[PDB]
Amino acid sequence: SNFGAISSVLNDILSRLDPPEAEVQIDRLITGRLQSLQTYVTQQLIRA
Amino acid sequence: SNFGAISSVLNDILSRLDPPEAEVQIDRLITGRLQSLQTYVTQQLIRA
Amino acid sequence: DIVMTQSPLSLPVTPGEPASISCRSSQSLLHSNGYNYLDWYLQKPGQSPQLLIYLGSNRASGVPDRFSGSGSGTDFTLKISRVEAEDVGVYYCMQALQTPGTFGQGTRLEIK
Amino acid sequence: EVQLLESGGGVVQPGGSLRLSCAASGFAFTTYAMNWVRQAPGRGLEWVSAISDGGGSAYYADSVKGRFTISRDNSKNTLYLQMNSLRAEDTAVYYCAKTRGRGLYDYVWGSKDYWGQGTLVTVS
Amino acid sequence: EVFNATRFASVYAWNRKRISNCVADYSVLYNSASFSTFKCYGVSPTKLNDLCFTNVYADSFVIRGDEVRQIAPGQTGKIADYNYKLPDDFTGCVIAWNSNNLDSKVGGNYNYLYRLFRKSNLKPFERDISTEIYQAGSTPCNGVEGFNCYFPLQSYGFQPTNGVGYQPYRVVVLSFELPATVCGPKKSTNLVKNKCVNFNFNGLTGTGVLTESNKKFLPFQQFGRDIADTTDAVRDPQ
Amino acid sequence: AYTNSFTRGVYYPDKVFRSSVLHSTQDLFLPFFSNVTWFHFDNPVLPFNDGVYFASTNIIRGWIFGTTLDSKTQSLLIVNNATNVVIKVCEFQFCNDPFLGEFRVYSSANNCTFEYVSQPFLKNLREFVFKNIDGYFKIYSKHTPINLVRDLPQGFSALEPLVDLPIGINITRFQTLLALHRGAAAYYVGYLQPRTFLLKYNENGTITDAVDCALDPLSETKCTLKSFTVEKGIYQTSNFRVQPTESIVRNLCPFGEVFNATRFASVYAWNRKRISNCVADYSVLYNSASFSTFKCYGVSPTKL
Amino acid sequence: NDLCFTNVYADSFVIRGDEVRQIAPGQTGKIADYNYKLPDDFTGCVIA
Amino acid sequence: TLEILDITPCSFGGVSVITPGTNTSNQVAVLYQDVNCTEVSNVFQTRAGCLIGAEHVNNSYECDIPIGAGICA
Ligand SMILES: *[C@@H]1O[C@H](CO)[C@@H](O)[C@H](O)[C@H]1NC(C)=O
Ligand SMILES: *[C@@H]1O[C@H](CO)[C@@H](O)[C@H](O)[C@H]1NC(C)=O
Ligand SMILES: *[C@@H]1O[C@H](CO)[C@@H](O)[C@H](O)[C@H]1NC(C)=O
Ligand SMILES: *[C@@H]1O[C@H](CO)[C@@H](O)[C@H](O)[C@H]1NC(C)=O
Ligand SMILES: *[C@@H]1O[C@H](CO)[C@@H](O)[C@H](O)[C@H]1NC(C)=O
Ligand SMILES: *[C@@H]1O[C@H](CO)[C@@H](O)[C@H](O)[C@H]1NC(C)=O
């Protein structure tokens, strides 16, 4: 999932972008994926 | 709650703004409302 | 085609007096949109002719306000309130409906 | 600002050809319609030909079907009128004159607000 | 034939060139002191020689220099709303350079032309050529211009005398849509089997190990994915 | 003609291999159990409507494609010639009787733009899918030996892409192409809608069956459950809402003392009027034929 | 006037009145890449 | 007009099926949650929404497919 970034896959937007705006794109991807993994860990804690 | 956006009601900021700034404002509203909903679901899971 | 008639052709009008100019059409020039299709012109001697009134009623560009066209269907009339030495010219009439663009015989306005 | 220039037209042997060129300076020659007018010395005007935008639609009057050849250049803003089989009754003041008409029911042969400068063709 | 084309079209009826199945050299485009505006969205101008795309469109028109700003994702104004619309997810880039000595002349060049009048904002990548006049008043024009009845198309009026922002600026838009076919030069080396390598298979970058696949493909299938955008199998493009 | 196409109209939605996986794709597809029109010389005019499924059962040779099918616009005309195919996206004249006369459906090739030559396409059932997306024109096909030619034959078949066509043309109506010959053949026409299907890929990497996700309420559960054998129970599939219809919406400035006033002032002694706290009607200002000059800057005259 | 710094650097050069826009963090151009590149984490101020 | 009005949101809700398993049968019933379905076969209006496609009966059973409010298929 893009999470609002221009592409979901990490290496394509690393490949096709300069660091000043890739920093923005990677930051939005990290925010989305960190939210997803935290949701998973919380639900595993309740299930455990 | 605005969650740091321009206005909490959706249709006014969709109306009085161009679409490119409106995507950022809608994104801010979605992040706030989504995180509030996730907080409610997690509290409800623990209470259940 | 459209058998056209401009009458009378030679018009000796005193300057300052109004002059009435007519052109007649065999077929109705009122289209389905409600507008009139016949155009009024003037030719100065040695100077190229101008559109004076398009579509029977409205301002062509640069035409003074005392020139006014009238009429509906077949019987149309061109009127000038005041005639001066700059108003000498020969007045024509043209349609826009059929394939041949039919002109008038030319209404020569003369100063006495 | 807006004015029309002509070129050519003079002494010519009948039964041949001639060239008359109409160049425009200050208008949108692509969008405006275009028209052709003959005027003899001693009687008023007669329409001979008309064209719509981009070529394609070419119209002729009753005596001049096939006798006259019309052409248009949208790049160099020039109007041409290629001449064939000249006659002594074609001795008239020939000049290009433009039309308003840009609407659907404006009828390209219709309301012609400007007229060109003018030149005389002598077929003798 | 796109850049040094003799005549560019007007912005309402701009010309489209399809670019496919060739190798593009973007060094001559970024390495030119002629292009005033070189601003690229979604790609960097430096790394354009290592990206490989399915198809490239070239859109060419002439605007005044003051409104090269409007040719951008998510801009407003006249040209952006009625003549030329770029979407907000635009990939590719727009460039411009001054062309006063080719498109502006003494007496005004009245060939280049733009739409000012239209009832609605234009869709991105759907551009019209229509010449029906605009009715701004209440009276139906019925195809008759006059008062409250405007022809929606008029010229720019290019003078050499006017300021730098009013000079004709030839705008060429490049667009990239990401089986890639249009890409610049690099040494297509030999395949390395059974080793942990950094593959670049026709732009599909990544790392991993490369073995043969025993699973049967079909002649139209380029690569293989199992689940959740993981590139399982690939074909070499040679 | 009302006929029931059972399960046909399914193709590979992309060029990507998948195996042993369920996949839900949303693309232009022929809906399951659809009302395809049966056409039986005689070939009526029928419109495109964004994607057409053509199935037929050898005097049928090709198709013409376009908007006017005449000089007013560009058009496409794809014909087999029993050795290859010719694909013209040229500009043609009027084709009043579309047939190969030695041919006449190729009317004229003035102005004309594109040409392509490729492999030929060649009871039997040859079924085809034609669509435009993104400026392209993509074709899919498969041929199958059948025997139920009296009606629509049952089976499953997947359609593979043959060629891609970089066209970008306004297409809205089209013909099949049978030359004027004086055997009775039948061809079926389907239409495509943007509906989501769930495809099951096999170990061959092939489609085996699918579910039309708006066909019946059971297949919505197969969509939302990503399976084909729904276990017994109650399944929350989707939501619904009634959509709103016919949306509703719930002092005059002294302009007459500015415009229709008797005595005005000289240009050195010009007047001001400050105007505030009223409701201003500029539609009366704009709708007047007296104003020989109308110009302003920074605002639009209609949108004031 | 209120903030104290461990080290303050001043850098001076002459460019064109167009190329003032390149002297900024995260910018491209001839001056921005081949003559004077500002870092992305630039904590400073520019005067022309 | 200076009248007073009321705003109640127009009807929404989840749709939900009743399936007995595909290997048993292919018929399904559909439940529309909290709809007084005068508007969009056999209809049954319960407190748990109204049920389309299921046959009302009189005698009671120990049931297996729950719907709500004591009604179960
Ligand atoms: C089919 O078309 C190709 C296209 O050039 C041509 O070369 C070939 O001769 C044609 N064959 C027949 C049988 O018409
Ligand atoms: C085709 O070219 C001829 C040659 O100039 C031209 O007259 C005609 O208008 C063109 N037709 C189209 C549809 O472009
Ligand atoms: C295609 O032509 C039809 C004319 O029937 C028109 O209605 C439609 O808007 C055109 N579409 C495009 C994309 O130009
Ligand atoms: C498909 O795969 C099966 C087993 O996976 C194999 O037996 C068969 O030959 C393959 N090919 C087909 C059906 O064309
Ligand atoms: C449905 O609405 C009608 C209209 O008033 C009402 O009479 C009926 O009792 C309602 N049914 C339920 C179950 O609320
Ligand atoms: C169920 O019982 C009620 C009780 O009176 C009766 O009215 C109704 O007809 C019965 N339904 C059937 C299907 O027998």
CSV table of N, CA, C and O in Angstrom, one decimal, chain C residues 58-112:
chain,number,residue,atom,x,y,z
C,58,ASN,N,-28.1,45.9,-35.5
C,58,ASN,CA,-27.1,46.2,-34.5
C,58,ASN,C,-25.9,47.0,-35.0
C,58,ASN,O,-25.8,47.2,-36.2
C,59,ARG,N,-25.1,47.4,-34.0
C,59,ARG,CA,-23.9,48.1,-34.2
C,59,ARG,C,-22.8,47.3,-35.0
C,59,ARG,O,-22.2,46.4,-34.4
C,60,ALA,N,-22.6,47.7,-36.2
C,60,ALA,CA,-21.3,47.4,-36.8
C,60,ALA,C,-20.2,48.3,-36.3
C,60,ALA,O,-20.5,49.4,-35.8
C,61,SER,N,-19.0,47.9,-36.4
C,61,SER,CA,-17.9,48.6,-35.8
C,61,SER,C,-17.5,49.9,-36.5
C,61,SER,O,-17.2,49.9,-37.7
C,62,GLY,N,-17.6,51.0,-35.7
C,62,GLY,CA,-17.3,52.3,-36.3
C,62,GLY,C,-18.4,53.1,-36.9
C,62,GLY,O,-18.3,54.2,-37.4
C,63,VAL,N,-19.6,52.5,-36.9
C,63,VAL,CA,-20.8,53.1,-37.5
C,63,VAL,C,-21.4,54.1,-36.5
C,63,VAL,O,-21.7,53.7,-35.4
C,64,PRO,N,-21.7,55.4,-36.9
C,64,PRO,CA,-22.3,56.3,-36.0
C,64,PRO,C,-23.8,55.9,-35.7
C,64,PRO,O,-24.4,55.2,-36.4
C,65,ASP,N,-24.3,56.5,-34.6
C,65,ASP,CA,-25.5,56.1,-33.9
C,65,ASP,C,-26.8,56.5,-34.7
C,65,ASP,O,-27.8,55.9,-34.5
C,66,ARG,N,-26.7,57.5,-35.6
C,66,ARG,CA,-27.9,57.9,-36.3
C,66,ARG,C,-28.2,57.1,-37.5
C,66,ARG,O,-29.2,57.3,-38.2
C,67,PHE,N,-27.4,56.0,-37.8
C,67,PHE,CA,-27.8,55.0,-38.8
C,67,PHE,C,-28.5,53.9,-38.1
C,67,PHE,O,-28.1,53.3,-37.2
C,68,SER,N,-29.7,53.6,-38.7
C,68,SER,CA,-30.6,52.6,-38.1
C,68,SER,C,-31.4,51.8,-39.1
C,68,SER,O,-32.0,52.5,-40.0
C,69,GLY,N,-31.4,50.5,-39.1
C,69,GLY,CA,-32.1,49.7,-40.0
C,69,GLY,C,-33.4,49.1,-39.3
C,69,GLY,O,-33.4,49.0,-38.1
C,70,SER,N,-34.4,48.8,-40.1
C,70,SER,CA,-35.7,48.4,-39.6
C,70,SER,C,-36.2,47.2,-40.5
C,70,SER,O,-35.5,46.9,-41.5
C,71,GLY,N,-37.3,46.7,-40.1
C,71,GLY,CA,-38.0,45.7,-41.0
C,71,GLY,C,-38.1,44.3,-40.4
C,71,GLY,O,-37.4,44.0,-39.5
C,72,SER,N,-38.9,43.5,-41.1
C,72,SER,CA,-39.1,42.1,-40.7
C,72,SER,C,-39.6,41.3,-41.9
C,72,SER,O,-40.5,41.8,-42.6
C,73,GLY,N,-39.0,40.1,-42.2
C,73,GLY,CA,-39.5,39.2,-43.2
C,73,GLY,C,-39.1,39.6,-44.6
C,73,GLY,O,-38.2,38.9,-45.1
C,74,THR,N,-39.7,40.6,-45.2
C,74,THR,CA,-39.4,40.9,-46.6
C,74,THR,C,-39.2,42.4,-46.7
C,74,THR,O,-38.4,42.9,-47.6
C,75,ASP,N,-39.9,43.2,-45.9
C,75,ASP,CA,-39.9,44.7,-46.1
C,75,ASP,C,-39.0,45.3,-45.0
C,75,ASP,O,-39.4,45.5,-43.9
C,76,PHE,N,-37.8,45.7,-45.4
C,76,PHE,CA,-36.8,46.3,-44.5
C,76,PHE,C,-36.5,47.7,-45.0
C,76,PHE,O,-36.7,48.0,-46.2
C,77,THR,N,-36.1,48.5,-44.0
C,77,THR,CA,-35.9,49.9,-44.3
C,77,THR,C,-34.7,50.4,-43.5
C,77,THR,O,-34.5,50.1,-42.3
C,78,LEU,N,-33.8,51.2,-44.2
C,78,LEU,CA,-32.7,51.8,-43.6
C,78,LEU,C,-33.0,53.3,-43.5
C,78,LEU,O,-33.4,54.0,-44.4
C,79,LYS,N,-32.7,53.9,-42.3
C,79,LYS,CA,-33.1,55.3,-42.0
C,79,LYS,C,-31.9,56.0,-41.4
C,79,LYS,O,-31.2,55.4,-40.5
C,80,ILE,N,-31.6,57.2,-41.8
C,80,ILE,CA,-30.7,58.1,-41.2
C,80,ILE,C,-31.5,59.3,-40.7
C,80,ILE,O,-32.3,59.9,-41.5
C,81,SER,N,-31.2,59.7,-39.5
C,81,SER,CA,-31.9,60.8,-38.9
C,81,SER,C,-31.4,62.1,-39.5
C,81,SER,O,-32.3,63.0,-39.9
C,82,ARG,N,-30.1,62.3,-39.6
C,82,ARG,CA,-29.5,63.5,-40.1
C,82,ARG,C,-28.5,63.1,-41.2
C,82,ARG,O,-27.7,62.2,-41.0
C,83,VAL,N,-28.6,63.8,-42.4
C,83,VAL,CA,-27.7,63.5,-43.5
C,83,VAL,C,-26.8,64.7,-43.6
C,83,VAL,O,-27.2,65.9,-43.6
C,84,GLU,N,-25.5,64.4,-43.8
C,84,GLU,CA,-24.5,65.5,-44.0
C,84,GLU,C,-23.7,65.2,-45.3
C,84,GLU,O,-24.0,64.3,-46.0
C,85,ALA,N,-22.6,66.0,-45.5
C,85,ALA,CA,-21.7,65.8,-46.6
C,85,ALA,C,-20.8,64.5,-46.5
C,85,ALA,O,-20.3,64.1,-47.4
C,86,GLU,N,-20.7,64.0,-45.2
C,86,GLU,CA,-20.0,62.7,-45.0
C,86,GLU,C,-20.9,61.5,-45.3
C,86,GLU,O,-20.5,60.4,-45.3
C,87,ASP,N,-22.2,61.8,-45.4
C,87,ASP,CA,-23.2,60.7,-45.6
C,87,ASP,C,-23.5,60.4,-47.1
C,87,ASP,O,-24.4,59.6,-47.4
C,88,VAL,N,-22.8,61.1,-48.0
C,88,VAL,CA,-23.0,60.8,-49.4
C,88,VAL,C,-22.4,59.4,-49.7
C,88,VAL,O,-21.3,59.1,-49.3
C,89,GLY,N,-23.1,58.6,-50.4
C,89,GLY,CA,-22.7,57.2,-50.8
C,89,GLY,C,-23.8,56.5,-51.5
C,89,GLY,O,-24.9,57.0,-51.6
C,90,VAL,N,-23.5,55.3,-51.9
C,90,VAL,CA,-24.5,54.5,-52.7
C,90,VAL,C,-24.8,53.2,-51.9
C,90,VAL,O,-23.8,52.5,-51.6
C,91,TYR,N,-26.0,53.0,-51.6
C,91,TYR,CA,-26.5,52.1,-50.5
C,91,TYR,C,-26.9,50.8,-51.2
C,91,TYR,O,-27.8,50.8,-52.1
C,92,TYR,N,-26.3,49.7,-50.7
C,92,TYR,CA,-26.6,48.4,-51.3
C,92,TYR,C,-27.3,47.5,-50.2
C,92,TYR,O,-27.6,47.9,-49.1
C,93,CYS,N,-27.6,46.3,-50.6
C,93,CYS,CA,-28.2,45.3,-49.7
C,93,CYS,C,-27.8,43.9,-50.2
C,93,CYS,O,-27.8,43.6,-51.4
C,94,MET,N,-27.5,43.1,-49.2
C,94,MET,CA,-27.0,41.7,-49.5
C,94,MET,C,-27.7,40.7,-48.5
C,94,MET,O,-27.9,41.1,-47.4
C,95,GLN,N,-28.0,39.5,-49.0
C,95,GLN,CA,-28.5,38.5,-48.1
C,95,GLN,C,-27.4,37.5,-47.7
C,95,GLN,O,-26.3,37.6,-48.1
C,96,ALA,N,-27.9,36.5,-46.9
C,96,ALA,CA,-26.9,35.4,-46.5
C,96,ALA,C,-27.6,34.1,-46.4
C,96,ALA,O,-27.0,33.2,-45.8
C,97,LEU,N,-28.7,33.8,-47.1
C,97,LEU,CA,-29.4,32.6,-47.0
C,97,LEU,C,-29.0,31.6,-48.1
C,97,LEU,O,-28.4,30.5,-47.8
C,98,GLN,N,-29.2,31.9,-49.3
C,98,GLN,CA,-28.9,31.0,-50.5
C,98,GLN,C,-27.5,31.0,-50.9
C,98,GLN,O,-26.7,31.8,-50.3
C,99,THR,N,-27.1,30.1,-51.8
C,99,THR,CA,-25.8,30.1,-52.3
C,99,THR,C,-25.3,31.3,-53.0
C,99,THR,O,-24.2,31.8,-52.7
C,100,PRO,N,-26.0,31.9,-54.0
C,100,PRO,CA,-25.4,33.2,-54.6
C,100,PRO,C,-25.6,34.4,-53.7
C,100,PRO,O,-26.8,34.6,-53.2
C,101,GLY,N,-24.6,35.1,-53.3
C,101,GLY,CA,-24.7,36.3,-52.6
C,101,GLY,C,-25.2,37.4,-53.5
C,101,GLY,O,-24.4,38.0,-54.3
C,102,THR,N,-26.5,37.7,-53.3
C,102,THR,CA,-27.2,38.7,-54.2
C,102,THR,C,-27.0,40.1,-53.7
C,102,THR,O,-27.3,40.3,-52.5
C,103,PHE,N,-26.6,41.0,-54.6
C,103,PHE,CA,-26.5,42.4,-54.2
C,103,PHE,C,-27.7,43.2,-54.7
C,103,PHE,O,-28.5,42.7,-55.5
C,104,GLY,N,-27.8,44.4,-54.2
C,104,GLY,CA,-28.8,45.3,-54.7
C,104,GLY,C,-28.2,46.2,-55.8
C,104,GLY,O,-27.1,46.1,-56.2
C,105,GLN,N,-29.1,46.9,-56.4
C,105,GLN,CA,-28.8,47.7,-57.6
C,105,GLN,C,-28.1,49.0,-57.2
C,105,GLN,O,-27.5,49.7,-58.1
C,106,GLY,N,-28.1,49.4,-55.9
C,106,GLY,CA,-27.4,50.5,-55.4
C,106,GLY,C,-28.2,51.8,-55.3
C,106,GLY,O,-28.6,52.4,-56.4
C,107,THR,N,-28.3,52.4,-54.1
C,107,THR,CA,-29.2,53.5,-53.9
C,107,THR,C,-28.3,54.8,-53.7
C,107,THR,O,-27.7,55.0,-52.6
C,108,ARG,N,-28.2,55.6,-54.8
C,108,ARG,CA,-27.3,56.7,-54.8
C,108,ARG,C,-27.9,57.9,-54.0
C,108,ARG,O,-29.0,58.4,-54.4
C,109,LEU,N,-27.3,58.3,-53.0
C,109,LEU,CA,-27.8,59.4,-52.1
C,109,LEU,C,-27.0,60.7,-52.6
C,109,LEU,O,-25.8,60.7,-52.6
C,110,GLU,N,-27.8,61.7,-52.9
C,110,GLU,CA,-27.2,63.0,-53.5
C,110,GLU,C,-27.6,64.2,-52.6
C,110,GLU,O,-28.7,64.2,-52.0
C,111,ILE,N,-26.7,65.2,-52.6
C,111,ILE,CA,-26.9,66.3,-51.7
C,111,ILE,C,-27.4,67.5,-52.6
C,111,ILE,O,-26.8,67.8,-53.7
C,112,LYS,N,-28.5,68.1,-52.1
C,112,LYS,CA,-29.0,69.3,-52.8
C,112,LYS,C,-28.8,70.5,-51.8
C,112,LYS,O,-29.7,70.7,-50.9
